[model samples]
Target chain A: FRKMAFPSGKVEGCMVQVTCGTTTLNGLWLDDVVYCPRHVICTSEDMLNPNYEDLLIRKSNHNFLVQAGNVQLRVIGHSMQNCVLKLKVDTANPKTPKYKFVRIQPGQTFSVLACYNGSPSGVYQCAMRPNFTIKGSFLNGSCGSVGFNIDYDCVSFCYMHHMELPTGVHAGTDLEGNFYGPFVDRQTAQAAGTDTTITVNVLAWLYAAVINGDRWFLNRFTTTLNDFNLVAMKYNYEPLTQDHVDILGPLSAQTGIAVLDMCASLKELLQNGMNGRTILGSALLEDEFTPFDVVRQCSGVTF
Target chain B: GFRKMAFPSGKVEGCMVQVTCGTTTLNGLWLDDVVYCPRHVICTSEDMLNPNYEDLLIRKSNHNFLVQAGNVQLRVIGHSMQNCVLKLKVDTANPKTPKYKFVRIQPGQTFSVLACYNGSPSGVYQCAMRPNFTIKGSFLNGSCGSVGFNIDYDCVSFCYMHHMELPTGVHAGTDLEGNFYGPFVDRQTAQAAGTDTTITVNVLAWLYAAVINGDRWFLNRFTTTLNDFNLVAMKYNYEPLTQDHVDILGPLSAQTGIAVLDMCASLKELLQNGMNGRTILGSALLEDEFTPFDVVRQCS
Candidate 1:
């Protein structure tokens, strides 16, 4: 099969020569044939639908722009003719939802900004209609949210939500979902809802939402985190140790291209560009080396 | 000491020593506090490009700085950086005629001031100055030095300027001592504003502002008053007319064309005066006599 890759009728440690269809002396020699072995990526598209059985999952990004109380979504008919979108307060609520029937022209993209039918001042979910775009027409589909305030258009929902925290509250849901916080425990989440104490937990939750590939978070939050003096909550935190690196060292080769794509997604997720080591720690930790060194790997979140 | 700082004639001390700025060196024994005026100055603030000059300089210098540009020489007669900005003493030996101003100067930038040598009290200062010499850096301060008077017009915020008209129009027709003039909301509005002597000149000067600024609203309002003045003139209620040309009507034609020209030039002075914040008015009144002789110079 490796040799069959040449299909040129010549070979070496495996170099090959190919004959051109329109032959003059139409012949050329090539070596070390580079081709991608398939792997999954951590993209907004991939996160929205994890299809590992296909051995690779890549979806085109649904581009959108918001301004003047309108969300303009571009329907790129890569695998679909049109995409139906609805502006809703809650997708679960079946109230008279405002609809945008987009016909993405053949071999072309259809872009338009539709006014939200939701409340003017607060958050609204832009849920894709079932049987909308070919892939988007399903039960588990993607929805994005937006926020608007005085004089500012296209304000991210993350800012209005994060800044409104009663304090100590985590940014996203906790892994346990016990008390509905990104907190490690109940009391801490309770205190966060009422107390003004700065917490590393808040930072961790932000990291979680981003790594989990939530598109609606972090436009303005990164700068806000940079300003909110983390010194109050900073304890004896340290960087990742070599222990996990040794365990996951071979895994890098095994996962191959997926890790490469995942790193790119994390790089964009952090946005600061200085958090490479932090993301590396998160990646190896998720790889879950047998008898996982959570202490050494969860460096960004570990106290 | 202030008395000794009299106007310098072409002669210096008692000798016939010639002093010309930018051309000849000005050397003299000046008193430490006496402001000895040089022979001549070349440029004024009006010659500079900045229009928001007052706000920029005063606000930055915080109301404390010296001004010596063109022929005008002013010093801190008295001032308070807090409440009032510039309490200036210019063209005088005594503090009796101090003027209040909200002045500003940029830090670390050079600005010209009229050169006045201050003779050292310990001895004489054989001083010399360049034409349009400049003061620079922190030497340009915001600290005030005034024997505070009842707050001069809050120079900081109450700043006002004439909003003028566009350049081309059935305009240049009327002059400042404009016949169809004083686009004042009314006689009371005009009087309620600039001091009587300055009222007519102020309103007249505003014409230059309106015209220069292409202030359509002000001009539109001005056209209203002008149409009224022309109406009065046409009614032949003219002599003891049903109305009046508050400033001066369009063309006086050639009857008193010289006066029209004279008043036209005089109108420019009124504008410069108002812009410089001076209230001296009546002098421009001489041109008013020319108003009584016009035939509304005809135009196509």
Candidate 2:
């Protein structure tokens, strides 16, 4: 089936499955749509248990199936938007087994249980797969002789084992072996470590407190904060410790705003406005009131 | 033929007057020259103060003649001394003694004397007859006329060199004679690593023109001095300091406190380079003296 826009009202990040006759494909719901290419077809209904039918299906296709999480697959009328699956293989010497690709029809099935003779051993898939091809080797006593299969057409099978997600996205599978995502990447996880909504509300409260404080205090905070930033740039973004704050010690005495409260507001604004980075030398620290001014007013310490 | 020659009073004793007889003029007839002839004689003598005696006319002499008077003598040497008159009198306009003797004058007071020349008032002649007495820091006004010669002298009075407290808490000052008298800065005090101990004072002198109408101070010159130096010995010009000069030197003074002989040197550099008033303030090295005050009275 042609890859079309996602059905309206379909929730994103949800697992999707498509079955056409005896073939099955899995994919994840995307922002707009999902892709189901013809190469990725996993016959296994359950990823954990390998049935004779699943083994038979892989032998007919002549493709080794590695379990790919959150990948797309397609076959005539049968496809998976995002799912996890494993493939069964028949080989003589698991090392150096010769291989090739074979096309199969919708209802076709084959079995490798008759030729299987090796104990389970772990082998990582290639970091990248070029053309939906899979590599497998026959065992020495299992099959006729030791040989390897380097099938380029079945390379997409390797992707089932491991794949790279887009920035701010991660890959994972559900309990039923159905993969789904666009999960948050490490950077997004760190950035969203705190409840942004609560932090934003807290920032708003602090900003209102500053504005509602003494009018002269607000003005002093504005100028003093600018001076602090100027001093901070001189130190090349070195953390401004209490010593730097002491330069602005007079402001604490004059204004009712305690120095600790000032530092709290400054820290909050920095965390929110600059993604938890120090605001010194940041381009966002210009004379605008949105975020920079918030930090500026909060850190009433002068240079 | 015979004729009596007239003589002017105060005439040099040995001055000679030649008498012309018809087409031929008799030569070398001295002031006391005796000529024997018998006829009607005409004798006349002009008063010394009379305008007629202003020009002590003397006829051309074929031989060199020496005219001598009391301490005043005119030697006629070259043949080019033709019909030249010698008028001699002590220059009363410019007395040998200073006009204001022992008069206490303020700093930058302009004292002028009438310069007199015994001969032509032209520059060449006036320069040739320049006064033998040399006064320090004096210049001719260059106004040459029949009686228009002036030697202008600016009386420099040393300002009270009060103690200037440096940021290091050391006091610096100069004596009444404008010599720097301050504590010797050691190498350790100077933060020197080797034998490079040096005491440098940034000196700025304000040369003022205190006239009758109004008084103004010019940032006359600025210098950086090493050791004891005389401020009065520093050269100064008649050029009045302007705001532009102050602006240029103000920043330098702010950077380094004005030393004794430095003011005028910096002023000269600024004047020569034609630097205009581009005042750059807010130097971190600024000193206390640069603070605004009664500059005319306080500046040195």
Candidate 3:
């Protein structure tokens, strides 16, 4: 009975794959509507082949990116036949790619982080599939139909703007520990046609992810900061100065706190942020207030 | 201490002895939990030095009484007053407030007070009997003792129908205070007939009146029946009020004269009852049971 306040925008060029039992239905977002992808024949004989491409099996390469915003994922089942909705994410890795998956029951709705403000770049492939614990097929048209439908939107934040990092802070780290910026200059944002706002967005995204109880995002964000410190050391190959050491020390401590436990770290951060306590200090924010405010608004959390 | 005999039926009849003292006659029967002229009649001696003479002595005094929600019964315990008028006072609003009003009782010698209005019972009530010299007393100097006692009762459970698909002739609506009213027969005609001496209300008003007085038992009972009717209606594809539905509401209406057959006001009442710690009955829709109502679509 919770109502989520989503930012406004039509989903653009979203690609999705839905699997019920063994059968899979792949869909694409176009013209503000979801439609089946067109089939492509390899040969003349392939057209008549028993393995002919059906609307349900055809694949679309269209990428669903949340780039500077949030995306809502709504999955509704009309008789899922005891199958659970399973969401899988492939981290755009070819060699020994890492995969994260979550299983949700039918008749559930929630938001997922696609790529907020250039964090967790568009290289990841996520699919919403259904898995059955019992022996059943979605194709069997019993009692009502048995299939799942997904509705989502690409929502961009209205408050996003170019932000300047403290001097000497070269790159920003996303929830994936993936470096997204050398955003020390405004020219970098101008050339990329994106804002240089990463800290606020990452914090806001983390808050949203945790509030939804999405453990995947929590685990990722927990480790991402530690990973960023290692990458920062490499990027600054020369011996670290006192200023760099000062920034890295807080980051190191915050990451250590996050590593202690997931919920504990989250509670600590939530309490500190609510109490106007800054954990990252000068490492993540020029001032403590704005980032915490962004987290509160994004999560829609209140005391 | 005195010698006494217990009557099995709590009342005694036909005593052989009687006494007459100074134009005030006393019978030998046990009346009002006390034996009248006991010493004069029991010993068979007119001058046996009656030690309980005051027990036979008649004077203007108040008798002990029990205040009931509806009926009243008088006891024979003697006080200092007899010519007293008992008034049932109630506060419809804040019970702690000093403001109160007297409830009119039926015209007769009965000690009962009118506990209902329109169709509902009055709120928490108290009885106050004041000495009224204007009324005649059984004794020469009978005077009431200005007695008062709180009155409380458990009413018979009744059902409330909140749906709009009521029987064709019955109508119901909310009052200005958002309290449910009506289910009366012919609203417009009743309004017209009001000035013509033909105005009347159906039995449903009694249930409404009981609800108006914060009777959670009635409200809970009404909600339970309403939930039953809603489930039945949903089962029949939301068909109009049927005999089956009316039959379902029969027991509650039979007891309280409030036949709530059908919707919005009922929900409001259920919500209020839920807030007041009464268990709100849930109804099923499309195989899903919802508490209060359909959480996502209706109540949300």
Candidate 4:
């Protein structure tokens, strides 16, 4: 019943599945600042530890390396900050595989028009060594660390979205609720081209065709930090992160409300030229709406 | 069973008559017995116009006296052409004396031979022609016992027909509703011999009288009769309309049958007044919300 806020400020809403035994109930969670997954709202600030929680919200970096062929090299930076990155290839000695360092900033990425062809195989690396002064001195390596990695494999690739070890379904359990997914590769992707239907199950749902943002743990050292922007730009499947529940929950609550509230809520969405069903998108979503009449049952299938 | 032909003059008492069984017609035939008599008929030449030399003389002689269809033959039986002449003549000539006239005629006095009538009979059958066009006979197949449109089986046993049309009006039904009919112990108990019959008899008689006096003289009576006994016995043990039952009134529980008396009340209203323009009789809500009356029985 506790109100939960999506760390990603870009979030408007989302849906979550509640699994009890074999039954699954869907709930829409919207950004209300006052409501939640149920007809429940978050407890007051006084009850929620009343502690000033200074939490720096980190997002998955929108940057990663791309290996076009066997030995083609490229670096992409989607960050807003301007900095000189230390890059390297063929890192057999941990820090020794540093490739040619390059200067790049937001939207300015490079790989030269084509790759330097060969048997392309190496652990490509890049690091952010920004110069800043605290007591007025430019420093090199101690204050922080930020970098990304890409491994080359000729056959196929295997990976997931999250870096958190595993927090299971029930509390205190050592294992079991891991959502490992988007595990796809050129081999499997090739296989999919010919395969008309893909079987569905827990294992199949975990196939990493693209990076899943929802399952990605923010600010975790164990994360692969795969460039989701690349995955979305190149692959057919993308992570299902923006759940429809988020939109539906708020909309249902808003539209069913009285005139002032109902129109006001809709005004927020529609003023942006957003239509109702556009956001609903077959999620069977809803929003605050006019109060439906109380149906007194007389017969079958009545409200 | 004897049959007579109704005439075009609206007087069924005519002496000379024509009768037909669909295709065959026998005309200008006088009664074999006296005009005021019953049952003495024979077909013979002197009294009838068709004095056949097997024909009305020379044509192609295509006439066949044997009418046949699928083993169901209908031809003149006992047509003793030699035997009927004198007997028919004697009976017709004597107005002063009534005598045995056992002669048969041509187109010979047809009576449904093998034509099927599957059930027992009852209906107003006129016997005596009244002097001033007034008639008298108790109606049969007219009571509310066994009837309906297209019903093959007549409802027997404890069935009843309402004898009086529910006195038509608002308050016309109030008195009837003010008593206990039943929420019977069970089905059989409501049907028990000594169960309260005041409601059954009242409703029945009221319905019966209303119908018989109107255009639906017997049909309504029969249907009401057919339904009455069962209806009466069904409601025999019900609680009065004034009695409040949590079962009927409701603090709605999940789901179960709730004994309701409004059923009796509703029917009473409908029978008494019929549906008004907007006031619907009991609807889906009523059925879903209430229990039907059966019995509170032990048979024990």
Candidate 5:
């Protein structure tokens, strides 16, 4: 490697240099954003999924508009401190510049839900500090800044059922007198609970009981309905009464996508993206995945 | 390496004129997995057609491996367990086992409705991913083949099984009562207590896991069982999701069939012509290049 004694931030100096060095290429993001397939540049222009119409928003007491996008906003440092944060408008365009206003604090975090709608996307900085935190509460002034998001209509009830990943086989039809496969041992019985662990054994079954039309977790269901399961032992401690079921039931039966969406609204108070994946840290709802219809009405979880 | 290596930025390299990812093993094994690790992989464009992904680069200090993709991919074992193909089995059963790294479908994600409990509890229905990568597809991972298996009963005991489903090309059933019950390959190292309870087995016998565990589940494994429902599987929770479930047979994870062929060739001589099915078995864990002609005669 040749030493490049070039002017620090300028590229016009006649200095011996390495082309890969920043001193020579100020226009290229050679350091943090170099492309690769090892050879190709890893650019969002080539990436998939990020190009969408929805932008997940992140709430912050202090907000900063995106520098390059067609976005504008009055400096909001202290005003948005106590108010719930939201995107100014349809933030689906890549030209809609992203903004963030982070606050500095002791052991504090500034969270937001940046819902990216569609592509031609670019990196929108999210390092803004919020104004202040409530004296002794983990809650942010504008609950949205707490930063969490979930689909509300589903539940990823994970458990310790061991791994039983079956190879070279699949069952498309539900067989009679036989549901679990014929493995010589539990090692062969592949059961999955969630991203956390695989459940080779059925500790329990989670049933979505329809009461008055809404779907709720039935730890003990009418065996005649035949949905009784020993599903993993998770909890569903949300405030619910018979009236609640009556109000939410039709949605469950109609939508059929339960778990996550049902709980999304309950925890959005902390953050937009469910405050970033600390499940138990959030409010504990039920232990089972939500049914089909539950997710239809949710915006955060219910969304 | 902890104490030897300082905090965020406290090395002589900090003042170095140039710093690059010197030498460390990159995720060459999984470039696609990182596309959905959510932590690193970033994408700004969604394509109805083929779209190349942007890598999430994390370089601290002067030295570090230029981590490209951040993901774990599951591969289906070929014909290793052809007899009892549809069953779910782990790569290893030791609880204190080494962590096999890969992303998995979290709670909120949706998996293929491989089998409906049909209103039952204790049941088993096997389903794997499709051949996400194909010899002939515009998109590198557009799979037209499938992986799936079936089992009659369901119990806590049938949590997971074979890594791949046997080829429908070689119609077969579980050897639960048949010959190779010897646990030759899928021999259980350890079986937990009450894991064999059949008391309420009747309740969960219809491949109703989402009903059984009361949670959304994904049978993340290193095998592909080409079954019907195995055609198109997707995870709905788009935020912070991983490629574990989609990696195996989906576009995310693409393993070479050459490695599988090697494994089959090794097992072939060991079990003589009996293990000739290993070709199909090993291939199940990988994408296909050429469907071997021996698959028929071997299983026959």
Candidate 6:
């Protein structure tokens, strides 16, 4: 319900985890950007150099990470200098609106962070104005976030994927939620190992697993300096820190992500060095991402 | 309780068919489900015939059924047999039939055996194939058992069978995404010990073997009879004589009972302080008897 230019500061603990040889590109959002985990609907080549007509996004993790009413932003792409980002929402009740907008500059990225709170589950969004420096024209782009769940009951009720409603369902909390997914049905439209922006058409589902109650992305940070503490805390299993990398012993985010940054043999290190940590090499495969569709309750396990 | 044999595939069926204590090879410990004739549940070795069975499943057997590694099982009481070597005979000749003996489902009243419809649609918590199918009659409490698969379709409950090298466990599951439940195993016994008694056991089974042999009837029968309270008692004699067949049943088959049901919903009323002790039906084992209609509880 609010909008403002993203205050630029050195991002502290953001890390990226990926297959070693996979292309390394910083995940960027110039505004509330529509997003999805890497699905196999599109080929690697298509994902790298996406050709809407010629590409098939094949990589899909059934766990939906977004609650998009729709992503039909007609991006009016212009020259490198003055593209605009106009945004809008499709609310069931669009009359007395609760909306806002912001102008994004070229060099800056735009995003909104909404974490899990007990009751009135919070959803977030942001807008990006690619070419705000101009005076005449304003292009538009918008994005929405999905409502993920982490409950304590092993008995899953039904994880509904109502495109407009929040997405998630009965699943384990804390440990299990952090470690495992609800298993997906491979036959779903979402591909397993390719990159495509596939949209799931179904609504609700059920599962039978330990459902714990805890949030994966939230952490306990006493003092707040660079808001990245919350983001850093979500990277690993421990708390987040506001200080420099020197002050902290080990961060919980992606050592796999760090490895990716170093341009090292990524997958190997993730399975090896990054694996020395609990989840990396769990024989039980407790914390492994699976193919698409088998899942009952959708979870957000950022691998 | 009476037991019967299925032709061609040599499948078996009974109300509460399960392995007797120390004699599970022939008798399944829990009566997951049974297929009769082509209508009867087929064995693992015969699974290839089942169109529903995934092509990835390389091996299968009759009585000793094994889906894609560890997704399902159809074991007996005391005897531990693999695939279908032998089968129990049916005494359908006499519809009036003599009552085998008594039955019991202690720990609560609503805890009846699991039946066919209890199964979930394809792909809920699978290990081998994604979309692991979840059954309505599974629970986390002591009422029933659960499993987690390593692959997409397989369930890990049969991991124990894989360790034993007995052709009767599950695989073809997900990477622990499916429900491989623990802390709960069913307990079924006919009576303290007796011969005239009938036996039944519930199992959250996978139809790997039956699917392999083109015995669609067997699989269908097994699923249809699951938890229907359609008791099949062991008759005095039948056909399909083989070491594997004998491994499936004998006098050992008539002496016990085990029913499988999800304690979460149907058994909730029994969990209360003292409500679970009163017998409802004719059986004295269950304190309160649950009529056929009692099974309507699943999503609750």
Better of 3 and 5 by lDDT: 3
Q: How do the residues A1-303 of candidate 6 rate in per-residue lDDT, one tens digit apiece?
A: 011111111110111111113221111122333121222123344343443323213222221122222222232221111111112212122112122222221111122211111011111112111111100110011011111221221111111111110111111111111201222312223211211111010000000011121112122222233333333333331222222222111221312122112112211222344322322112111111111211221221110
Question: DockQ, per-model, please?
Answer: 0.01, 0.00, 0.01, 0.00, 0.01, 0.01
What are the runs in model 6 whose C-alpha is more than 4 Å off? A1-158, A164-303, B1-18, B23-86, B89-300
Per-residue CA lDDT of model 5 for B29-146, tens digit only, reads 1111211111111112232123222211322221222322112223322111122221112222222221222222211211111111111111111122112210111100101011
Candidate 1 vs. true structure, TM-score = 0.13
User: Residue-wise lDDT of candidate 3 within B20-101, one digit each (tens)?
Assistant: 2233222222222322221222121342333233343232223322222112222434322111111111111111122212
Candidate 4 lDDT for residue A230: 30
Model 4 TM-score on a 0 to 1 scale: 0.13
Each model's backbone clash number = 32, 55, 24, 72, 199, 218
Give each model a TM-score: 0.13, 0.14, 0.17, 0.13, 0.19, 0.18
State the lDDT of candidate 2 residue by residue for A130-170, as single tens digits. Answer: 11111221122221101111222121111211122322111
The candidate, 4 or 6, that scores higher on DockQ is 6
Q: Which stretches in model 4 have alpha-carbon errors above 4 Å?
A: A1-303, B1-73, B76-261, B271-274, B278-300
lDDT for residue B34 in candidate 2, whole number 0-100: 25
Candidate 5 Cα misplacement greater than 4 A, ranges: A1-78, A81-239, A251-303, B1-300
Global lDDT of each model? 0.20, 0.24, 0.23, 0.18, 0.18, 0.18
Candidate 2, residue B215: how far the Cα is off, in Å:
33
In CAPRI terms, model 2 is classed as incorrect
Summarize candidate 1's per-residue lDDT along B3-105 as a digit string, tens digits: 0011111111111111122322221211222322221111133422323323433433312333332234445343222111212233334322223231232
- TM-score preference between candidates 2 and 6, better one: 6
- Alpha-carbon runs more than 4 Å astray in model 2: A1-231, A234-239, A243-251, A257-303, B1-262, B265-300
Global Cα lDDT for candidate 2 = 0.24
Candidate 5 per-residue C-alpha lDDT over A1-303 given as tens digits, one digit per residue, 9 for 90 to 100: 000010111101100111111111111111111100010111324323221112212323233232112222222221111111122222232221122222222111111211111001000111111111111111111111112111221111110011113221211101011122221111223432222111110011121223223222222212211111122212212233234334445444554534333333332321243333323222222222222212211211111
Best by TM-score: 5
